Design a protein around this nucleic acid. Structure first.
Ligand SMILES: [Cl-]
Ligand SMILES: [Mg+2]
Ligand SMILES: [Mg+2]
Ligand SMILES: [Mg+2]
Ligand SMILES: [Mg+2]
Ligand SMILES: [Mg+2]
Ligand SMILES: [Mg+2]
Ligand SMILES: [Mg+2]
Ligand SMILES: [Mg+2]
Ligand SMILES: [Mg+2]
Ligand SMILES: [Mg+2]
Lengths: 40, 215, 120, 244
RNA sequence: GAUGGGGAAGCUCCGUUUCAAAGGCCUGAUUUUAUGCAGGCCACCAUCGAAAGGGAAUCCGGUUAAGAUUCCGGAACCUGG
RNA sequence: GCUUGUGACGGCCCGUGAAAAUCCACAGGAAGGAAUAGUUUUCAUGCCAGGUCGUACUGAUAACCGCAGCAGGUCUCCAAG
RNA sequence: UUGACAUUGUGAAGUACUUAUUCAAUGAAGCGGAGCUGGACCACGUUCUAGCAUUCAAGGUCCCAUUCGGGGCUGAUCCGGGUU
C-alpha cells in the first residue's frame, strides 16, 4: 500500500477507506437525532 | 462579540475528560523522600521520654536574635587574618566550640553561657548537656539550628557554642541575656523532667476521635 | 506555596553531563591504517579459468584479505591500477581465502591491465 | 518408594495451564472515583468464546475519565446481555441485568454474579456458567451484607463489594453426557494435563499407597486424616462420613 | 535470561515489571559554537528464541571439465537518499 | 478426466481452531501558506547507492547413523499411456 | 500442630487506639474535615438510540505596552500534604 497512489486507498467521502457508506449513513442519522433530543 | 461564543464544559461524572489538576498530594515520591517524612511522623506518634522531649522547646525568635547578635561580636580569627598575626599580640576573646572542648569547660565551671543545637541526629552526643549544665550551675539555652551555630565559627555545623570570658563593655548585655535564658531553660528543668512528649494523633485520627467524643 | 504537579509520577531529573577531559592520552600513539590498499589487494589469481575471464569477460581476478568488503576492494583497485570498476563479486574459497571478481568499465581493457601488472 | 503422582504436580513442569488461546483474565473495572460516587456507561462490543471456559465472555468499552482514549474490559457475560447494549457500573447504577453495583445498594433477594470478596479485587465469586449469588441480608450499622454462595455456604461480605446483576450465561452445560473418551480428551486438551487418570490400586507399591497385592484392593481405610503428610494424602481426606 | 531487589557460609537461587529517582524524537530558543536553554508529546521500561511460522523487491535466453533465479545479453522491480 | 489453485456455500465441537515486527486509511485541525507570486516529491520523467555470511557435491542396497561400500534406521516437493 | 518466651507499644473496665508488623490495589486522581447552594439528617451536572467527546478551554475579568501574542485570578470553594 505504500507504493500505490492515495486514490487507490480511499473513497471521496467521510470515513472513505475506513467505514462503508451504509455505516457512515447510520452515524450521521444517529448524530443528528440524538443531539436534537438533547435540546428538548 | 458576534463571533466568539461561550461554551462551558461539563466536568461531572461520565462527562468531558477531566482537566489538569494539582496532584501533589498523590505524588509517588522516591523512597528516600518517604522515609524522611515517615521518620518525622513516627517520632511524634510514639510517647517521647522527658530526656528527649525537653529538646522540643527552643529559644524564641526575639531573644535568639539578641543572642546571636552578642555571639557574632566574638567570631574566631579566620585563616586570612591568621597569616597576618603569625607574620606581641593582645589576649584574644572568642567563642569556644567543639563538643569535647565545651564539655570540659562546663565541668570546670569556666563557661558562662552555653548554646545547644536541637537537631543533632545522633542525639546521644548532646542529650546529657542540659543535665550537666544544671548540675554544674552553668546557664544553657537550646537553640534552633546546628548550621547557624557553625556559621559563627566558620564551620558547616557546630552542634555547640559557649562563652567563657566577655569584654567589660558587653558584661551588661551578657547578664541581661542570662536572666532571660535562665527563666526559659534552667529554672523550668525540674518540671520538664517529669513531662512526656509525643502521643499526637494523625489528622484523620484526630477528627475521628473528636467525632466519636461528640456523638 | 509549592510546585503544581499535574502528574502523580516522579521522574529522575535531568542534570548536566560533562564531556571527558583526560589528563593523559589513552595510547598517545595512533595506530596506522590497518587496511591500506596493499593489504586489501594481496595478489592476482593466474589460473587458466581466471585468465579466460580477463581476455573475454574484461574481469580481473584477485585474492584479497578476509577483512575487506566490496567498498574497500573497489577503492583499492582504483588507486592501485588507475582504472574504473563496474562491479565487484566476492566469495570465500574452501581453503579459507577470499577471491574477488572485479569487472572494469567499457573504457578500460582488462588484458592491457594484466600485462602491465606483470601476469599474462 | 518414589514420588507419587499428586506430589509431582506441584513442580509445575507438564501440569501447567494451557493458556495460548485464552482471551484474557476476566475482571471488573478498577474501583475508581466514578464507580464509588456515580456511574459510568459502557458499550458491549462482542460476545466471544474463551478456550477452557464454559461461560462466554463480553467485551465492554468504556471511556477514560482522565485522558482522551478508550479502555477495554473483559467481563463474564450474563444471560440476556447482547451486543450493542449499554452497561452501567457504579454506586448509582440502575437495577438491570448486566449492571455492576455495590452489594449495599441492591434490595433483598437480588441475584448477582462475579461478586467481589473484598472491594477492589475485581470479582471472585460465582464465575462458572449458571452460577449466582443470592443476597439475603444487610447490616447498615456494620456496613456488612449477608449472601448465599453456590455451594450453599453463608458468607458476610462488605457492602462496598461489587457484583453484576444476573446469572452467568452458558448454564446447563454439564447435563449433556460426553458419551465417549474423545470428547473428554478435547475438553482437557485446552485446560491442563490431568486426563486420563490411572487408578492407584492398579499400580505397584513403589508407585502408590494403594499399589500391590495378589488381588487389587486398598488394604487399609481410605479415610486419611488432615494431619497426614505429602505422599500419604491419597483417597478420602478428612472425611466426616462415607457411603451413599 | 540480565538489571532493581530479596535469599544463601558460598559455588549461586528466586523473579521478568517485579516495594526503583529506570529512557529519548519533533522542534522552538541561538547566527560568540555548537548544542546550553523554553511549552508539550510519550511512560510502552534489557536481551535471546523459527534456513518448514510472520516477512520490501527478478524474470527469460545463453554460457563451464566442474558455477549460476548469483556469471553474460536483454528486460524489470524494491528500499534508502 | 488427473494434479493443483480459488470462489460462494454446507456439516461438526462442554474442541470455535497463535503472537509480534511492519504498512495503510480515517477522525482531528496545531501550523504553513498567493498576484507578480507559492506549494505539492502519495502524478510523470530524470540522478546516486545497496554492506556482511552461506552457495561445490551426496542425500542413501556405496558420500548420513548403525565398528563396514551392513537386506536395518532416517523429514519432504514434482508424477505419462 | 500445640504451649512458652522474644518481636511487643498505648487506654479503660470486669474491649478500645495507632505507630510496629501483616494483606491488597493503583502508570499512587479526587481521601478526611469544613463551607456554599437545595431538599427533608440526605442530595448537590451524565439512562429511549452500537454517533461524537483530546491542543494550558471557550467565555468573564485583571496586566503587558501592541505584532503574529504572552501573564494572573475565575471558570473548576477552602483546609490538612495520611496515595487508597
Ligand atoms: Cl504416578
Ligand atoms: Mg556471496
Ligand atoms: Mg501390574
Ligand atoms: Mg508405599
Ligand atoms: Mg498406609
Ligand atoms: Mg535467573
Ligand atoms: Mg532474535
Ligand atoms: Mg550444478
Ligand atoms: Mg547446487
Ligand atoms: Mg559415524
Ligand atoms: Mg560411533
Amino acid at each position: 500500500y505504500a507504493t500505490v497512489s492515495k486514490t487507490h486507498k480511499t473513497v471521496s467521502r467521510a470515513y472513505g477507506g475506513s467505514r462503508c457508506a451504509n455505516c457512515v449513513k447510520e452515524r450521521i442519522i444517529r448524530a443528528f437525532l440524538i443531539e436534537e433530543q438533547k435540546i428538548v | 462579540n458576534p463571533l466568539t461564543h461561550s461554551t462551558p464544559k461539563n466536568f461531572g461524572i461520565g462527562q468531558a475528560v477531566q482537566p489538569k489538576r494539582n496532584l501533589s498530594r498523590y505524588v509517588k515520591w522516591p523512597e528516600y523522600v518517604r522515609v524522611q517524612r515517615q521518620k518525622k511522623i513516627l517520632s511524634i506518634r510514639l510517647k517521647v521520654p522527658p530526656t528527649i522531649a525537653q529538646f522540643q522547646y527552643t529559644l524564641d525568635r526575639n531573644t535568639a536574635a539578641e543572642t546571636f547578635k552578642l555571639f557574632n561580636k566574638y567570631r574566631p580569627e579566620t585563616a586570612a587574618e591568621k597569616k597576618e598575626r603569625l607574620t606581641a599580640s593582645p589576649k584574644p576573646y572568642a567563642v569556644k566550640y567543639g563538643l569535647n572542648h565545651v564539655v570540659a569547660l562546663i565541668e570546670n565551671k569556666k563557661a558562662k553561657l552555653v548554646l545547644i543545637a536541637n537537631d543533632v541526629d545522633p542525639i546521644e552526643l548532646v542529650v546529657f548537656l542540659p543535665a550537666l549544665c544544671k548540675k554544674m550551675g552553668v546557664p544553657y539555652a537550646i537553640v534552633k539550628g546546628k548550621a547557624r551555630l557553625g556559621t559563627l565559627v566558620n564551620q558547616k555545623t557546630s552542634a555547640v557554642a559557649a562563652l567563657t570570658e566577655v569584654r567589660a563593655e558587653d558584661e551588661a548585655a551578657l547578664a541581661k541575656l542570662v536572666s532571660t535564658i535562665d527563666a526559659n531553660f534552667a529554672d523550668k528543668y525540674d518540671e520538664v523532667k517529669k513531662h512526656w512528649g509525643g502521643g499526637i494523633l494523625g489528622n484523620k485520627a484526630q477528627a475521628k476521635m473528636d467525632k466519636r467524643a461528640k456523638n | 506555596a509549592l510546585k503544581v504537579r499535574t502528574s502523580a509520577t516522579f521522574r529522575l531529573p535531568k542534570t548536566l553531563k560533562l564531556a571527558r577531559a583526560p589528563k593523559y592520552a589513552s595510547k598517545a600513539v595512533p595506530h596506522y591504517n590497518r587496511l591500506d590498499s596493499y593489504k586489501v589487494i594481496e595478489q592476482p589469481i593466474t589460473s587458466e579459468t581466471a585468465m579466460k575471464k580477463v581476455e573475454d569477460g574484461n574481469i580481473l581476478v584477485f585474492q584479497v584479505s578476509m577483512k575487506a568488503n566490496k567498498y574497500q576492494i573497489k577503492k583499492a583497485v582504483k588507486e592501485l591500477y588507475e582504472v574504473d570498476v563496474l562491479k565487484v563479486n566476492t566469495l570465500v574459497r574452501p581453503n579459507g581465502t577470499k577471491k574477488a571478481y572485479v569487472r572494469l568499465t567499457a573504457d578500460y581493457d582488462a588484458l592491457d591491465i594484466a600485462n602491465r601488472i606483470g601476469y599474462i | 518408594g518414589r514420588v507419587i503422582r499428586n506430589q509431582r504436580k506441584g513442580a509445575g513442569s507438564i501440569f501447567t495451564s494451557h493458556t495460548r488461546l485464552r482471551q484474557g483474565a476476566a475482571k471488573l473495572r478498577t474501583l475508581d472515583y466514578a464507580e464509588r460516587h456515580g456511574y459510568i456507561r459502557g458499550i458491549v462490543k462482542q460476545i466471544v468464546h474463551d478456550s477452557g471456559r464454559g461461560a462466554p465472555l463480553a467485551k465492554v468499552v468504556f471511556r477514560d475519565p482522565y485522558k482522551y482514549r478508550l479502555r477495554e474490559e473483559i467481563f463474564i457475560a450474563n444471560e440476556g446481555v447482547h451486543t450493542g447494549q449499554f452497561i452501567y457500573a457504579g454506586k448509582k447504577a440502575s437495577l438491570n441485568v448486566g449492571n455492576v453495583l455495590p452489594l449495599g445498594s441492591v434490595p433483598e433477594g437480588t441475584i448477582v454474579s462475579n461478586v467481589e470478596e473484598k472491594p477492589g479485587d475485581r470479582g471472585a465469586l460465582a464465575r462458572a456458567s449458571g452460577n449466582y449469588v443470592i443476597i439475603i441480608g444487610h447490616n447498615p450499622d456494620e456496613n456488612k451484607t449477608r449472601v448465599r454462595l453456590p455451594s450453599g455456604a453463608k458468607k458476610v461480605i462488605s457492602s462496598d463489594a461489587r457484583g453484576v446483576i444476573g446469572v452467568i450465561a452458558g448454564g446447563g452445560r454439564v447435563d449433556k453426557p460426553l458419551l465417549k473418551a474423545g470428547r473428554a480428551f478435547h475438553k482437557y486438551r485446552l485446560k491442563r494435563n490431568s486426563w486420563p487418570k490411572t487408578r492407584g490400586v492398579a499400580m505397584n507399591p513403589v508407585d502408590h499407597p494403594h499399589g500391590g497385592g495378589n488381588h487389587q484392593h486398598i488394604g487399609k481405610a481410605s479415610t486419611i486424616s488432615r494431619g497426614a503428610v505429602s505422599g500419604q494424602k491419597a483417597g478420602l481426606i478428612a472425611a466426616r462420613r462415607t457411603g451413599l
